[PDB]
Write an enzyme that holds these catalytic residues in place. Structure first.
Site, PDB file in Angstrom:
ATOM      1  N   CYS A  30      40.071  33.265  38.451  1.00 55.77           N
ATOM      2  CA  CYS A  30      39.868  31.678  38.277  1.00 55.77           C
ATOM      3  C   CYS A  30      38.559  31.492  38.979  1.00 55.77           C
ATOM      4  O   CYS A  30      37.365  32.249  38.841  1.00 55.77           O
ATOM      5  CB  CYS A  30      40.892  30.966  38.945  1.00 55.77           C
ATOM      6  SG  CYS A  30      41.953  31.159  40.237  1.00 55.77           S
ATOM      7  N   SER A  31      38.405  30.417  39.676  1.00 56.04           N
ATOM      8  CA  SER A  31      37.345  30.371  40.570  1.00 56.04           C
ATOM      9  C   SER A  31      37.388  30.965  42.047  1.00 56.04           C
ATOM     10  O   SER A  31      36.771  31.760  42.166  1.00 56.04           O
ATOM     11  CB  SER A  31      37.173  28.916  40.989  1.00 56.04           C
ATOM     12  OG  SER A  31      35.848  28.592  41.444  1.00 56.04           O
ATOM     13  N   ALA A  32      38.341  30.544  42.688  1.00 54.42           N
ATOM     14  CA  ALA A  32      38.703  31.089  44.094  1.00 54.42           C
ATOM     15  C   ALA A  32      39.466  32.513  44.075  1.00 54.42           C
ATOM     16  O   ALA A  32      39.388  33.333  44.818  1.00 54.42           O
ATOM     17  CB  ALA A  32      39.278  30.308  45.043  1.00 54.42           C
TER      18      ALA A  32
END
EC number: 3.1.3.48
Length: 283
Positions: free
Chosen positions: A221-223
């Protein structure tokens, strides 16, 4: 700990929700604490030469489980990428959980994909959400793009209501390999999805696309912890349900918390996992 039958699990969900979701809070606090007596090293993540390869200074990749890139001649940390192997249901290293790629790590990213023989990418973020950059576009908008020795070609796209499927051809310059990206596009800027059904469909289809027998499925995802963890737990439990008609969310989650920090990052995601599994069972 103990896997329980679907019927028992279904009632346990109602148990967890009762008394203002008191059970859900107890479980997640248990999850949060389950590695407190564990000192898990992440030296490579924290090395100064690797700093720019981390999307978040405080989201790290544990050493013991990190994906290593083959070293490049010339440097000493060309082996690093912020990514960990994560077990799936009855299978070690079923996944590679990683951050949304940075421009500075595009080449590392695709090299990992080539080296690990990964054939499926699961992307659970938009590039930009509420104006904040969450991931960089590591794939070609059209035709082909070159990242190091890997050339990536976009072959086709299907854009559904809640997710997009991009078929790529990739080849190493030293169209050899197919790589399919399942890109969920409807995860809310804040909170979790209001309806699990679109997420369940995304998980079933993306999971079904896994070919025997290939490298681990890349999930990001993002992290690479929150939604990514949520995807991993849901997929794995659906697997377990289909195979044994039992489920063990808490047990499985505390286990993979040893393999990457913060997997399933919030209580709300932990609850969503159950909401989604309940609907799968009822469907």
């Amino acid at each position: 700990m103990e896997a329980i039958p679907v019927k028992q699990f279904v009632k346990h969900i109602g148990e967890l929700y009762s008394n203002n979701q008191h059970g859900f809070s107890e479980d997640f606090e248990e999850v949060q604490r389950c590695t407190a007596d564990m000192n898990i090293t992440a030296e490579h993540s924290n090395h100064p030469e690797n700093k720019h390869k981390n999307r978040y200074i405080n989201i790290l990749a544990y050493d013991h489980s990190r994906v290593k890139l083959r070293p490049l001649p010339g440097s000493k940390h060309s082996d690093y990428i912020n990514a960990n192997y994560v077990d799936g249901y009855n299978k070690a290293k079923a996944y590679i959980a990683t951050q949304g790629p940075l421009k500075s790590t595009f080449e590392d990213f695709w090299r990992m994909i080539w080296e690990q023989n990964t054939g499926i990418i699961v992307m659970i973020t938009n590039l930009v959400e509420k104006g904040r950059r969450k991931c960089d576009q590591y794939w070609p908008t059209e035709n082909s793009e070159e990242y190091g020795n890997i050339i990536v070609t976009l072959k086709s796209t299907k854009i559904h209501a809640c997710y997009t499927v991009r078929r790529f051809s990739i080849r190493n310059t030293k169209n050899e390999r197919v790589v399919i990206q399942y890109h969920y596009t409807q995860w809310p800027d804040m909170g979790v999805p209001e309806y699990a059904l679109p997420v369940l469909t995304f998980v079933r289809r993306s999971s079904a696309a896994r070919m025997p027998e290939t490298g681990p499925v890349l999930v990001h995802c993002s992290a690479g912890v929150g939604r990514t963890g949520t995807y991993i737990v849901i997929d794995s439990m659906l697997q377990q349900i289909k195979d044994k008609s039992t489920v063990n969310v808490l047990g499985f989650l505390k286990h993979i918390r040893t393999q990457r920090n913060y997997l399933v990052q919030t209580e709300e995601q932990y609850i969503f996992i159950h909401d989604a599994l309940l609907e799968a069972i009822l469907g």
